[PDB]
Write a protein that holds these residues in place. Sequence first.
Motif, PDB file in Angstrom:
ATOM      1  N   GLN A 105       1.319  -1.123   0.177  1.00 48.76           N
ATOM      2  CA  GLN A 105       0.152  -0.195  -0.132  1.00 48.76           C
ATOM      3  C   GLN A 105       0.834   1.388  -0.168  1.00 48.76           C
ATOM      4  OE1 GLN A 105      -3.235   1.981   2.490  1.00 48.76           O
ATOM      5  NE2 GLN A 105      -2.744   0.233   2.830  1.00 48.76           N
ATOM      6  N   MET A 106       2.034   1.390   0.703  1.00 46.53           N
ATOM      7  CA  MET A 106       2.785   2.721   1.325  1.00 46.53           C
ATOM      8  C   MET A 106       3.249   2.653  -0.095  1.00 46.53           C
ATOM      9  SD  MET A 106       2.009   3.431   3.448  1.00 46.53           S
ATOM     10  CE  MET A 106       0.486   3.516   3.107  1.00 46.53           C
ATOM     11  N   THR A 107       3.854   1.245  -0.982  1.00 49.21           N
ATOM     12  CA  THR A 107       5.027   1.429  -2.154  1.00 49.21           C
ATOM     13  C   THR A 107       3.974   1.904  -2.964  1.00 49.21           C
ATOM     14  OG1 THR A 107       6.514  -0.055  -1.880  1.00 49.21           O
ATOM     15  CG2 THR A 107       6.193   0.219  -3.229  1.00 49.21           C
ATOM     16  N   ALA A 108       2.353   1.850  -3.686  1.00 51.59           N
ATOM     17  CA  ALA A 108       1.430   1.792  -3.998  1.00 51.59           C
ATOM     18  C   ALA A 108       1.350   3.541  -4.104  1.00 51.59           C
ATOM     19  CB  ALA A 108       0.427   1.648  -3.688  1.00 51.59           C
ATOM     20  N   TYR A 109       0.905   4.565  -2.735  1.00 46.85           N
ATOM     21  CA  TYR A 109       1.180   5.946  -3.167  1.00 46.85           C
ATOM     22  C   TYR A 109       2.299   6.357  -3.483  1.00 46.85           C
ATOM     23  CZ  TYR A 109      -2.095   5.263   1.436  1.00 46.85           C
ATOM     24  OH  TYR A 109      -2.595   5.681   2.473  1.00 46.85           O
ATOM     25  N   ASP A 110       3.135   5.582  -3.167  1.00 50.31           N
ATOM     26  CA  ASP A 110       5.138   6.570  -3.896  1.00 50.31           C
ATOM     27  C   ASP A 110       4.092   7.062  -5.165  1.00 50.31           C
ATOM     28  OD1 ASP A 110       7.980   7.288  -3.359  1.00 50.31           O
ATOM     29  OD2 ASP A 110       8.221   5.859  -5.422  1.00 50.31           O
ATOM     30  N   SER A 111       3.867   5.198  -5.970  1.00 50.49           N
ATOM     31  CA  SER A 111       4.063   4.984  -7.393  1.00 50.49           C
ATOM     32  C   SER A 111       3.421   6.545  -7.545  1.00 50.49           C
ATOM     33  CB  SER A 111       3.580   3.829  -8.075  1.00 50.49           C
ATOM     34  OG  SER A 111       3.008   3.334  -9.481  1.00 50.49           O
ATOM     35  N   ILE A 112       2.306   6.567  -6.938  1.00 48.39           N
ATOM     36  CA  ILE A 112       1.300   7.417  -7.983  1.00 48.39           C
ATOM     37  C   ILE A 112       1.190   8.745  -7.687  1.00 48.39           C
ATOM     38  CG2 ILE A 112      -1.492   8.335  -6.827  1.00 48.39           C
ATOM     39  CD1 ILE A 112      -1.731   5.621  -5.617  1.00 48.39           C
ATOM     40  N   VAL A 113       2.318   9.016  -6.967  1.00 53.20           N
ATOM     41  CA  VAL A 113       3.042  10.490  -6.311  1.00 53.20           C
ATOM     42  C   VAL A 113       3.820  10.593  -7.189  1.00 53.20           C
ATOM     43  CG1 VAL A 113       4.008  12.099  -4.856  1.00 53.20           C
ATOM     44  CG2 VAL A 113       2.254  10.642  -3.422  1.00 53.20           C
ATOM     45  N   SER A 114       4.896   9.536  -7.211  1.00 56.43           N
ATOM     46  CA  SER A 114       5.908   9.592  -8.367  1.00 56.43           C
ATOM     47  C   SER A 114       5.320   9.988 -10.516  1.00 56.43           C
ATOM     48  CB  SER A 114       6.511   8.398  -8.099  1.00 56.43           C
ATOM     49  OG  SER A 114       7.289   8.232  -6.618  1.00 56.43           O
ATOM     50  N   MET A 115       4.492   8.975 -10.622  1.00 64.99           N
ATOM     51  CA  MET A 115       4.268   8.885 -11.795  1.00 64.99           C
ATOM     52  C   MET A 115       3.751  10.743 -12.051  1.00 64.99           C
ATOM     53  SD  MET A 115       3.167   7.238 -14.367  1.00 64.99           S
ATOM     54  CE  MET A 115       2.676   7.981 -15.849  1.00 64.99           C
ATOM     55  N   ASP A 116       2.616  11.463 -11.123  1.00 61.41           N
ATOM     56  CA  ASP A 116       2.426  13.151 -10.589  1.00 61.41           C
ATOM     57  C   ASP A 116       3.497  13.284 -11.123  1.00 61.41           C
ATOM     58  OD1 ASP A 116      -0.145  11.093 -10.605  1.00 61.41           O
ATOM     59  OD2 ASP A 116      -1.197  11.817  -9.082  1.00 61.41           O
ATOM     60  N   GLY A 168       6.212  13.435 -12.813  1.00 59.61           N
ATOM     61  CA  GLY A 168       6.926  12.955 -13.759  1.00 59.61           C
ATOM     62  C   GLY A 168       8.443  11.945 -14.024  1.00 59.61           C
ATOM     63  N   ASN A 169       8.131  11.479 -12.569  1.00 54.97           N
ATOM     64  CA  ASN A 169       9.214  10.369 -12.353  1.00 54.97           C
ATOM     65  C   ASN A 169       8.324   8.420 -12.338  1.00 54.97           C
ATOM     66  OD1 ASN A 169      11.263   8.598 -11.623  1.00 54.97           O
ATOM     67  ND2 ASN A 169      12.085   9.941  -9.175  1.00 54.97           N
ATOM     68  N   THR A 170       8.481   8.964 -13.713  1.00 54.42           N
ATOM     69  CA  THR A 170       7.735   7.363 -13.798  1.00 54.42           C
ATOM     70  C   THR A 170       8.912   6.119 -14.003  1.00 54.42           C
ATOM     71  OG1 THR A 170       8.491   7.568 -16.460  1.00 54.42           O
ATOM     72  CG2 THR A 170       6.975   8.555 -16.240  1.00 54.42           C
ATOM     73  N   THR A 171      10.145   6.005 -14.369  1.00 52.93           N
ATOM     74  CA  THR A 171      11.098   5.673 -13.508  1.00 52.93           C
ATOM     75  C   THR A 171      10.737   4.548 -12.265  1.00 52.93           C
ATOM     76  OG1 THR A 171      12.631   5.915 -15.254  1.00 52.93           O
ATOM     77  CG2 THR A 171      13.127   4.676 -13.024  1.00 52.93           C
ATOM     78  N   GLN A 172      10.626   5.791 -11.029  1.00 48.91           N
ATOM     79  CA  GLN A 172      10.223   5.864  -9.586  1.00 48.91           C
ATOM     80  C   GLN A 172       8.347   4.510  -9.690  1.00 48.91           C
ATOM     81  OE1 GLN A 172      12.005   4.757  -7.062  1.00 48.91           O
ATOM     82  NE2 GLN A 172      10.556   5.346  -5.976  1.00 48.91           N
ATOM     83  N   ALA A 173       8.208   5.307 -10.145  1.00 49.22           N
ATOM     84  CA  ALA A 173       6.632   4.685 -10.908  1.00 49.22           C
ATOM     85  C   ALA A 173       6.326   3.350 -11.590  1.00 49.22           C
ATOM     86  CB  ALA A 173       5.737   5.360 -11.172  1.00 49.22           C
ATOM     87  N   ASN A 174       6.907   3.311 -12.740  1.00 48.02           N
ATOM     88  CA  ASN A 174       6.782   1.496 -12.807  1.00 48.02           C
ATOM     89  C   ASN A 174       7.374   0.559 -11.803  1.00 48.02           C
ATOM     90  OD1 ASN A 174       5.019   1.995 -15.312  1.00 48.02           O
ATOM     91  ND2 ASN A 174       7.555   3.650 -16.371  1.00 48.02           N
TER      92      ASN A 174
END
Lengths: 894, 897
Positions: free
Chosen positions: B814-825, B827-833
């Motif tokens: 769940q916490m990794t998911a929050y990071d992916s959401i915030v990272s994607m938003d 522009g850090n798509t590498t971290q998101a993926n």
Amino acid sequence: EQFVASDYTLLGDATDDPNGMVDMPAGQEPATTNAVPSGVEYNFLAATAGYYTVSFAYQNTANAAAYEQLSINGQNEPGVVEFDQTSGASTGTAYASVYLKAGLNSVELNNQTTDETNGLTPVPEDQLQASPAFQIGTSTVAAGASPSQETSAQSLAISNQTDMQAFVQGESMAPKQQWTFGPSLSELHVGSNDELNQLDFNAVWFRNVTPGQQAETYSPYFKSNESFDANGVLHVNYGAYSPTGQALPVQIQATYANVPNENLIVENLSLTNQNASGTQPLVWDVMNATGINPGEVSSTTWDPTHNAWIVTEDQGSGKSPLYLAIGDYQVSNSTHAAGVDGVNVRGSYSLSSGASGNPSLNAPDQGVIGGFENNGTMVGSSSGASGTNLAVGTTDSDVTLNPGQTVDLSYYLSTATSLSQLDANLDKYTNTVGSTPMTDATGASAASSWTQQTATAWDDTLNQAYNLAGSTETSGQAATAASGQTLDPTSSAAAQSAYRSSLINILQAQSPEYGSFMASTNPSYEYKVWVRDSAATAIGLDDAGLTQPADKFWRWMASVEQNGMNATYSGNASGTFSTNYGEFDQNLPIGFVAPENDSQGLFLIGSYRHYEQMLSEGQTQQAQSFISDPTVRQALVNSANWIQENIGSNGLGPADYSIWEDMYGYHTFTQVTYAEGLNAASQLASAMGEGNQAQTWATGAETIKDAILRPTTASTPGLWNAQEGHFVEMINQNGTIDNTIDADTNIAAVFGLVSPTSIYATENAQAVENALTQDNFGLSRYQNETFYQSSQWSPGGTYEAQGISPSWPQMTAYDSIVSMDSGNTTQANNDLSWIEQSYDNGGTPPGESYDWARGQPIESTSSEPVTASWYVQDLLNSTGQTSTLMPAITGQSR
Amino acid sequence: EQFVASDYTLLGDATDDPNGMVDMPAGQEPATTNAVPSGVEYNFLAATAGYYTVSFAYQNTANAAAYEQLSINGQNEPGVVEFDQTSGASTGTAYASVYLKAGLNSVELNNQTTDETNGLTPVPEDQLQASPAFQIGTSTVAAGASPSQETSAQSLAISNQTDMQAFVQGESMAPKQQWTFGPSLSELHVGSNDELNQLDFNAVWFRNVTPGQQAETYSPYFKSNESFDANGVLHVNYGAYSPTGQALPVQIQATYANVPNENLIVENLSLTNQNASGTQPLVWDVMNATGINPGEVSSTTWDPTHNAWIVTEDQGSGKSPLYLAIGDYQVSNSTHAAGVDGVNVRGSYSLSSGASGNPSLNAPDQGVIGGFENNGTMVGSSSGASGTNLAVGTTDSDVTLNPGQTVDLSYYLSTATSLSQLDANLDKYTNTVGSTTSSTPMTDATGASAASSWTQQTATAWDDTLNQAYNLAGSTETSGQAATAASGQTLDPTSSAAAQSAYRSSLINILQAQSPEYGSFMASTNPSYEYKVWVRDSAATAIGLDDAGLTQPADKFWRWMASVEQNGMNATYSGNASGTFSTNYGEFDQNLPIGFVAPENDSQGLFLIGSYRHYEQMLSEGQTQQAQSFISDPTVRQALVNSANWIQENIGSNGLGPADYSIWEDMYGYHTFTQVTYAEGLNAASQLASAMGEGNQAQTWATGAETIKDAILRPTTASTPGLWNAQEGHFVEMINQNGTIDNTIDADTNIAAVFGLVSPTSIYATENAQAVENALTQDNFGLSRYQNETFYQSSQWSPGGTYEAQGISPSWPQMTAYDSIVSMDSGNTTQANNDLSWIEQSYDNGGTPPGESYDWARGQPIESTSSEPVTASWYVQDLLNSTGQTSTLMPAITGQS
Ligand SMILES: C[C@H]1O[C@H](O[C@H]2[C@H](O)[C@@H](O)[C@@H](O[C@H]3[C@H](O)[C@@H](O)[C@@H](O)O[C@@H]3CO)O[C@@H]2CO)[C@H](O)[C@@H](O)[C@@H]1N[C@H]1C=C(CO)[C@@H](O)[C@H](O)[C@H]1O
Ligand SMILES: C[C@H]1O[C@H](O[C@H]2[C@H](O)[C@@H](O)[C@@H](O[C@H]3[C@H](O)[C@@H](O)[C@@H](O)O[C@@H]3CO)O[C@@H]2CO)[C@H](O)[C@@H](O)[C@@H]1N[C@H]1C=C(CO)[C@@H](O)[C@H](O)[C@H]1O
């Protein structure tokens, strides 16, 4: 940045103390129900990623060391932080070097010491469990790496640059050492008979005789660290008395000053009562006792003028005796005794027994030392004594130690080939430098003056070296860019310390008679000279501008080249070198792993770079002297002809064991030294009066280069794996590929056999970084390699390194050099910071290896001059003060 | 990329086999003089950094699992790779997901299994030392993460979407479980009396009776994994017989099909002889035995027409009995017995005893099961039986299993409130789908076809449900709703196979964990959390369904949540006043509040946020009648208004709402997490104001939302402290009861940026995200809740037992998911993926969403709370956010409108 106690989050049973410090509880966090870590945490904002030093002020008045796990960003750092017993009411500082991320980093200190690598704890489990309750105060986070606090060099040499080497050694020099005794001055080698160790030991005993306290002798069974200051004076800092586990309430420091261009060693003992202001002053007796080499029949008489024992020591068959003075700069409170030890100093106490009890309480009241151990009175003659097993001593009595007031007690050693010369020496060395019966005043001043002269003399030597660009060093040669380079100054304090420490340590490990370097200052490697190590060492001195001591080495190496009289194969033919030589002889080849065929090339490369370096410094007479010396010229030509003549039909030179000495085959490392050796030969051809050979050798260099770069999958295989983008370890004798990735293959790019920006260099560098990295920037030699770990060959004992394939600073240095040259300065600087925290306590260059499991350099081969050299090459390469690159190999002569 | 045996560098005592495979030696590398690792190494060139799956083909014909240390670039990966016993002459595949660097990576398998975290080995030391000699073949490196091979969900629910839930459970559902028995269908809850578990167990026994071999009964004491296929059918794959450590030479698979809009559970057993071609065919007897709830006085008679035991089971005081049919689709070679178990199925064998011996050999020749265990003959009546501790069974005899030829044996369960309804059911479910009502005797033909047809109907029915969900943009999904960008966004399609599996698995798992009667979600499918409903978990779950376009099952949940809101009649404080919710409710009742940690004041806001997003989602899909129905429903409308008024009225003097225990339930104070739900709750209320007939309240609630937002963003060093540490650049956990700052960095503070209470590109979002990534990362992209936190580790509260997680502060997907959401938003798509790939390898065997936690020390998701619908939801929110098919963002809080 400073973090006071009130900035901490307290964890577990860590509590605030009324006194404003934090009470850390005893013991290790168990793996039981509801177990939580006890300790402190705070957050630090790092402007930039890289190495920072984390410090904790603390007190530990228990009779055991405390251990805590340092955790950065929830990741346990390698090993544990040691909190040693603190003297009296003193405050200690524990510190570690850590890699921080850009932005916020969590810094935590806790009792979760329960992690293992390879089924091992970083210190014995029983010591982690016995970790006592202690108090921490302020924490500091400072930019930059610091040397290892926990691991010290335990054997270092002090040279007078002419004819005398002394070794100062801690109580244990390796985990596997079963006997315990130190610190001491334990070895003395003089030019007149260099092989012979003149001494058993010269060491200091301490006796508390404070009125109202239990009188007790503290013998040399102390934990200690030792390192050089900037001026070539050796410092020994005493820790806990191992047999009781006590930090004595007196802080003990010793300096050893081997005075260059003299025959004097001054020993200065600083005693500082660390008890609180206004407490009862302490009273100590101090004995400086010397055992002569037990086997040598010797005699001694007292010299009351100079306040010294005059020893005549036999030197063996057909050799004139040596004359030694062991003196006491204190006169008024001094007594003297000669006779026997009365005890076996190496059979009285073992570290393995822990805090087993003060062995002084078991000493019989016999002999110089037994007597002092027993009741503070040396037993023996105040006039003289004669025989084998000869011992002498001086005791200084009723030394009053007031809280916070340092008291200096000094002792001395001089040697001569005649009594008349020794007496002349003694008149000189019992008075101040400029300047009859010695007094407390003249003695104190003599000790001071000669200690200072040691510092001045080493400063004058080191002033021949380049100032580090951007450092506060000004008294050396002007910081200059090398050919190809632009100056890239560094304000790094860590770089300046390490640079200075590296240079002084290399020179102190050089034979003053012969110019050969000890591969290690630790007897684990028998003080043997490795001709590879010494060549690579001298390359570093040349880079640093220290062309005089470099020149002394290159001429020595030329003089010990095998001429091929007894040649049985290519490996010992004209132009080759013995893998090992003795450190205490002009030319004593020692049988070791053979053949190693890297020495020929490194001799040519280093001699070439030495010649050019002298020209760069305007030392044109010294350059011409070197290249025209018949021995140097003939040695260089023979080595060049050896490489040229021994090129095979595949374009590679003969198979060897190479740098790691552990496998036979066509090693990339050695092949590079072949190619660059012929390159160097071609460059020197005209200056050696061999102009007609220049083109042959240039062609040879290209032939070997082309073979190295030829794919492994080619019809005749080369050493380049084009599919995987890296050099292979070697081609095997049967023509198959040993595909093992070896960090030493970066040597191609280091010498510029490939351009550092070439596909070869960048792909190989990436392969090595990817596969061989531990502890962020530590590079292993190759994977699944057990030297210093499981291997029986491990010089300090098995599992000294717990993690398989330990980190080698030399390999991190190659990476830093290749990274800098390809524009990746971030990697280059991180590498330098990593090497700086691989150094031993007080900034001594380490041995070969660093245990990435424990975050500690290896003790057993500390200090290794070649490691110091590779740091110096790395650093000066990063400031543009040198380029490790040779001229591009093209197949055309200049 | 494929690496054949001859590509390996051999280490230590690893040798080439004449058969072309590599012989890996027995045992663990000791800490002795000259000890070396034994195993294989090769190098792989990775075009781009990221997660790859490393596979090894292998055989293990020993009666123990082998373990190897996987080492990437000289760094031992978390835990060990397990090489389980292989059936007959079959070849197995062991795999791990690993993060590779750009360029060359060394891949090594060795016996250096000697590393420890927190003084523990990742599997028991004795099992590492007993690791037998085995053979490895080809290795594969493939781009993308894969689910955990070693850890399976061990309890999953199958729903008929109307009135029946069954739980299928492995032999152990948690490390601390002292008893061993499974796999089995162990729980059955029907709408007529939902609280009651109708069954003790329904399970399958196997007896080898091959001529010339020692006849032996294999009882349900098997290692197993279980996961849903894309069509809502549950698969159970049998591993070793734990009591002997043998991979039986027959591969056993079971499918459970709970047919939607029916009252039928079909059990399909696939038996495949894995011995070599041309070897002697095996002959097996198979018993399907059912223990009724032991406490319930029950009777049974045989129904020879339908080939089933008809059970009347008492339901307790004042309730009509339930009627069950437990049937056998095989008619030839079928026998039947009713009576007692004759053994304690949960007291016959313990996993703790290791390979202690087949417990069947100790079974007395008594009872349905004792008899079959003893000599293959069930003991009891072939007519009927009555009492407590009632048991029934059917044995199918002389099943011939030829090498490589799968044989299907099927069984069934039906329930009804009347015998007449059960008989109608039985006529339907003993014939193929869309058969005219026949009360004629079932044959081998009609039975086989009935089982097949009803299994297929289960798949079809779940496909029709899941076709209401959006196709994942860039996936091979076409039968669902057209992939659409959310307003203002652009589609960012993903060709990731891992994403498609995880998306599909996530949706089916969420829906199978929903109460068919009530619409409430079980927080975990594992009984460690007592199948209780957490109103936070269920709200966050429904938010995910709405994002995926599954508005119908979402709507069923939102209406339920509205219906169970506390109206404040018995209010004693703000925490249980009008507009609040009980932390827990029962999963088997309309409205049974369960006392737990209280107050938790995050449910009010999440109810408003999710209801708002649900309303707008239905409008987005043109479901305007369903949207209007929802917002105007008196219960929903009143519930939403009461929650909004609760947040508004309870804003305190510092601009923050009341203190609570919040998401982690473990500390009392003014938690950033709950405060964000307050602010975004009022935001949601303001947006819905006009549609709820509360237009005049719109401006009040908008101002409320801004007031709480401004308090959250107010520095900790302000004269009245806020929740923003400006000096360190992160949100604090909370302000304490006494007004002090709890400065602890908590990964849940990313919820601010997830809802857009701060813009994801704001200094607040990026600095907080960096602080969390820096301090709380393990295993590359695993995020801990906060440091020095022992839940699943040392904590006595650990639901699966202490040290299930060995590493303190376990990783929470769940916490990794929050990071992916915030990272994607931002522009850090590498971290998101990388985050999405990390969550994908946090999933359990066969692609089941995990529980709450992942042991970063062992590289394994936690078993004890697998599967957790809210974890599945957060992955779905994360993934659809990264494809632009949803935005987790709420409208910006401004204080206007
Ligand atoms: C110092 C050296 O230690 C290790 O070397 C051992 C060899 O690998 C062994 O094979 C063995 O060599 C012996 C032969 O087997 C035997 O047949 C006879 O020829 O005597 C040989 C010498 O004993 O024993 C060696 C230990 O004595 C290790 O493998 C090797 O890497 C080590 N070399 C490093 C040390 C130095 C000195 O500072 C450097 O010059 C090198 O570059 C390092 O690689
Ligand atoms: C499920 C939950 O388990 C853990 O919570 C424990 C609490 O930390 C303890 O304080 C204790 O609570 C008791 C109170 O002390 C007592 O005064 C009374 O109120 O009864 C309480 C009931 O026992 O015991 C709790 C376990 O029983 C853990 O700390 C917590 O993080 C866990 N919460 C997660 C579980 C779910 C369910 O899916 C999610 O809703 C949450 O978001 C997770 O945080």
